[PDB]
Design a protein around this ligand. Sequence first.
Ligand SMILES: [Mg+2]
Ligand SMILES: [Zn+2]
Ligand SMILES: [Zn+2]
Ligand SMILES: [Zn+2]
Ligand SMILES: [Zn+2]
Ligand SMILES: [Zn+2]
Lengths: 65, 279, 56, 79, 392, 106, 110, 40, 45, 15, 56, 112, 43
Amino acid sequence: MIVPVRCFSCGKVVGDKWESYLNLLQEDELDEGTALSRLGLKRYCCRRMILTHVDLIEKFLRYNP
Amino acid sequence: PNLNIVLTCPECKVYPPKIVERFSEGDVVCALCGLVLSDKLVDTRSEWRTFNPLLDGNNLSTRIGKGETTDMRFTKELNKAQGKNVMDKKDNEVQAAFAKITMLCDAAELPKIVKDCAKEAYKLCHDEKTLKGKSMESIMAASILIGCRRAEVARTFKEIQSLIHVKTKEFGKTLNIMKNILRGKSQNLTYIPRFCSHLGLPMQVTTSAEYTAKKCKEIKEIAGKSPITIAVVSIYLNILLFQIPITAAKVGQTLQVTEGTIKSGYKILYEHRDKLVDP
Amino acid sequence: SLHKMSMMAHRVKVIPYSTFRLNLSVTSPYNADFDGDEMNLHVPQSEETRAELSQL
Amino acid sequence: KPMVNESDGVTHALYPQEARLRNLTYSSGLFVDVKKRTYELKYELGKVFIGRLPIMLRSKNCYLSEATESDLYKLKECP
Amino acid sequence: TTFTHCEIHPSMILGVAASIIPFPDHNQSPRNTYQSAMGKQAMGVFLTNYNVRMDTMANILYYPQKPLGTTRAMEYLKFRELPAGQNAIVAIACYSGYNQEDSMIMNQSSIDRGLFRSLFFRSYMDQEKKYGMSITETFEKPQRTNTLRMKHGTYDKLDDDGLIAPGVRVSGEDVIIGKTTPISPDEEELGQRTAYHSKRDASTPLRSTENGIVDQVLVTTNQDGLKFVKVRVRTTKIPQIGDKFASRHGQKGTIGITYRREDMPFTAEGIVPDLIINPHAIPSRMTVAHLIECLLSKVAALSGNEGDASPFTDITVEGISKLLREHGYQSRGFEVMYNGHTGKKLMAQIFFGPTYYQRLRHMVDDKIHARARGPMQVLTRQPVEGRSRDGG
Amino acid sequence: NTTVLADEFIAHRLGLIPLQSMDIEQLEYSRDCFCEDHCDKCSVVLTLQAFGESESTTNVYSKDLVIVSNLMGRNIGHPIIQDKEGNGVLICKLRKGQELKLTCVA
Amino acid sequence: GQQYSSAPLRTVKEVQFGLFSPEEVRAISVAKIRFPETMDETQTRAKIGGLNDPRLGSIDRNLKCQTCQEGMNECPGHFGHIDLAKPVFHVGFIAKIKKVCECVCMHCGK
Amino acid sequence: RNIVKLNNKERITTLDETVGVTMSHTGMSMRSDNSNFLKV
Amino acid sequence: TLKYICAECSSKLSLSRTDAVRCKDCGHRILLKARTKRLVQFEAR
Amino acid sequence: FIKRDRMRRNFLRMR
Amino acid sequence: LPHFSKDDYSPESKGFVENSYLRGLTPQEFFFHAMGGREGLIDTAVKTAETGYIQR
Amino acid sequence: NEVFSRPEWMILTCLPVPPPPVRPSISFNESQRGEDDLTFKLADILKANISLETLEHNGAPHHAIEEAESLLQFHVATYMDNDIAGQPQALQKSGRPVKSIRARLKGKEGRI
Amino acid sequence: FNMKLAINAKTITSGLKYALATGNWGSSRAGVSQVLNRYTYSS
Ligand SMILES: [Mg+2]
Ligand SMILES: [Zn+2]
Ligand SMILES: [Zn+2]
Ligand SMILES: [Zn+2]
Ligand SMILES: [Zn+2]
Ligand SMILES: [Zn+2]
């Protein structure tokens, strides 16, 4: 959840690519492969992270502490 | 005759047993020289897994009911045999009395703690000489009221009186001598949330009638004239301070209080309105 | 344990972690597979039963 | 509707979260109009509580059936 | 000709558990049954309000990930919103022999970065009671001077009310909730009961083999007004060698051994497998869908579009081989791997690609136990039964 | 910590965050230094304080870490920023009414 | 871990199975057990002459079991009895006795 | 004839009050008699 | 006395003993215990 | 051969 | 099945699976294959349950 | 065999009472004390025996004597074997059948 | 006569609460009520 830090194989930093990723998706309306091609990811080991991420922290923050 | 096993360390013998008990290893060991005192430790939690002395005592009994493969003739012959031996003990009154008391408490929607306190009170009284009768109704009503006073619960005399017709006077005498029995075997604030629940009032009016009840208990004048009227006039003032309308007739017919009494208390209460403001 | 081969003595080798490690040439008489299968280990407490257990 | 009568005597509304936290039983009270008559022989001369009934969640009697998304987030119940 | 009705879709004949299976047509039925049975115990996220609940024995995965070869029915089962597993790069090879008999080798560097790490929440509920009003249990911190039958655990983590505040790191044999019971002097008088006079200890400690950080503690009166207290302790369970893992095709097995990146085989591009399994799993079990999900998962990981893994469709293997061929890799899923120890090229190409996996409830930390002279039963005076009771 | 995330989970995410490591050659190990615990010879002390302000959620970045320990002329401890927008690694999100104060020992 | 005994140690060989004679039951027993109550009236100790009196065995370690002394980890136990005023039949023999009633005369007993 | 296939029954009515009134009328409410039935 | 927190309104009560279990200002009997004021050390491994 | 999840833009651009 | 005609003795409708696991199976074949799988599981379970009693 | 078995011995006259080492009672929390089922059966045998002696001492209703005799026979019969066919089953006050000795020696995972 | 002693509520309350509390539906029927398995969403 909430953007996994680094990657689960290669080790490249990806946490700083989520905000841009969504920014490229909601602004440029590009596809997922095109956005992942703009972020700089060239290996599918990283691609499965952003592509298969299920951000559940948004559904966790809607609860009052 | 003795029969008291005391564990001591023959090597230390310098102090009474200041030992430690190792349950995982099943031993008990002296915490000084480290010498074990006993092996193969028994457990109390493990024998309890398969499974009331406070009320039933040490008496044992077993039911006889019908079997998987049996005849109905044998079930009746065994129950009729117990019906002839039921006179051997005078404990039939405790089960029937606890059954009817169970029905009344279950009819009054009281918690199980008041039920156990009332059963314990009736067990303390039971069949003594100073009781000398009361036809089983007054000891039950008075036992319920005692179990209510012990569990910090509040039930008015007109409530149990509305449940059981005990004629009040004999109820008061039986409750008095019963209180003497309890003393020989050695608070109106709780009424406010109950009547506020009867009227369906918010929490601010409840705690406002709490502060009003305590302050009115501190101001003196009239003192009380039974705490029920102080409660109903306190809630009456705290509800005439806001805007939720009930008037005097509805609250007088719901809480069973006289209108002239809540107005008589509302007069002097309105006279003491000065020092009753919380905010 | 339906075989007499299903219970066999073994030489202890102390290794870390928490799983019993063994060679795969013994999983056929035990009829076992490395998928969550638990096994039992009994220890003799006498030299006579240890020698009789090692020679038989 | 679902309700809870406490030990002191106060009865208030019940929510499934507080029902799970307080180890209570999510039920609702049941009343019946009981009519009585006295004949003397065909000469002819009350809302009583009968018991509680456990209410299934997401049902027309439970409070959560009419709740929205944000309301379920207020009641601390996942949508 | 006389067709009166028509099926909406054949894939709807399956149940809920079988709907998670990718391409069940290409897989044998008993594997669909075994996977349908393992789908009822995998780790995941059941709801979002678990932060405000006191459920007993909970397991919430750190990074839940939706699969690549997804079935349309999952859209109706809320699986993409609440997945119960993670996609892991998997190679199918006979490496150092530690993969035989359904054994798996997992990358250690991937574990250190948080792969398949889950949280376990254990709730200890205690309650004080009153028998006949005369004896009243009270939650308090027991003093070692006047309290008899006190456990050997430490009582420094308790407060004045007899509870542990959340955040305090606790371990096994630690008392979480201190409760004492009144006793009578002329009732037992056992050992030193005529000297302690006061009360008897009856606290509820934590499990012997458990440890972690107390997450949340709450106190409330129940129905009859008895003050009970619920505790919830969290513990991260890092995947160990003895932990079991399953997939979506009936394939289940524990980890054989864990190696590091430099000890794991690698391809010419630089992707290291996070999990390697034994080839001999496939032919016997005849699960062909496990390879089709890996291939289609690779094509889905390269193209960026989640592949449709519905049962009865028109998707064939040749089309997925062509789509993978368009991306530059081998159309049959093979890829040239290099050894990790010598850096030499392997003679046989390895089937290499991502695959969705799930972590089951079965773990070694809740199974291993040894007994050497412990407590006996009261009836037969024999060793007791159960791991919590230290049984043989 | 009032976050919805677990404490050791946040500690894991912070553990995965990279840092600058140029002049690390002249920084001795923890076991090699003869002091107790740590000192300006073995480790670098960092800290993080985040608090939700407005109604919109605040994002905690790696750049929010400040260096409160002396470097003695070294160039380590600076969070590596490789994003095109100038924002560090998204550690966690916070709403109004939740604080997060911690001290890390690199 | 038990206490040493001076009796000669031998193995158990022949085992004979037989019925319990009432005279032998009265010769083995030590108590009569007349009170159906469990513990004493004071809710403590034992009833002394009841269902579980110190004349039998005991548990709880602390108690000594009067008639063996020693402890519970050593006490084999002790036997009581119940002298009935009306003879009863045994279940497992109800058939056998019946067969005997069909094998012998019901008057002269031949 | 199509219209006769539309017969329905009334559903159970839910009392919407503040509960405390009805719950007060359940148990002891200091109100007895008020109705002559089996009074002999 | 010890600091307690209300279930719904999350107010600071800090009630002492013999005060039952009930929030002031609202009738929510769920009272929180609050987290300890001392530091807790963790490891990133 | 992939799950078409961009039907919102197609339906928004078609209707 | 209610998807074929009555009095049909063709091998395809009577349970023949002419497709392979490489190209997938049709519903009317996957159903029969599920019947065979469940039958295999039940048969193995009964054979084990009786095998234990025979063993004792 | 005269030295071991007798038809007179087949008819029960005196009943042995086993020690608590056979039926270990429990005293949990000093206020929740549980007694074994055989203990309750012995209590039933004592109540039926004393009741029969009291009914046979003063007067003789001829019918209550047979009811108490069948009651004692039922308590001893269920004490030896509770699961007897054609006879009612004795049930404890908790809601479970009475555990007899034969039940301890009959079912699997028992004494054998 | 009294309406509080004639109509009892613990028969319906104890019957529904006991039947929905235990596995039995009153042994006729057993295993009807089971604890909800919260291992995952598909469970
Ligand atoms: Mg196996
Ligand atoms: Zn990667
Ligand atoms: Zn010593
Ligand atoms: Zn240093
Ligand atoms: Zn003895
Ligand atoms: Zn509050």
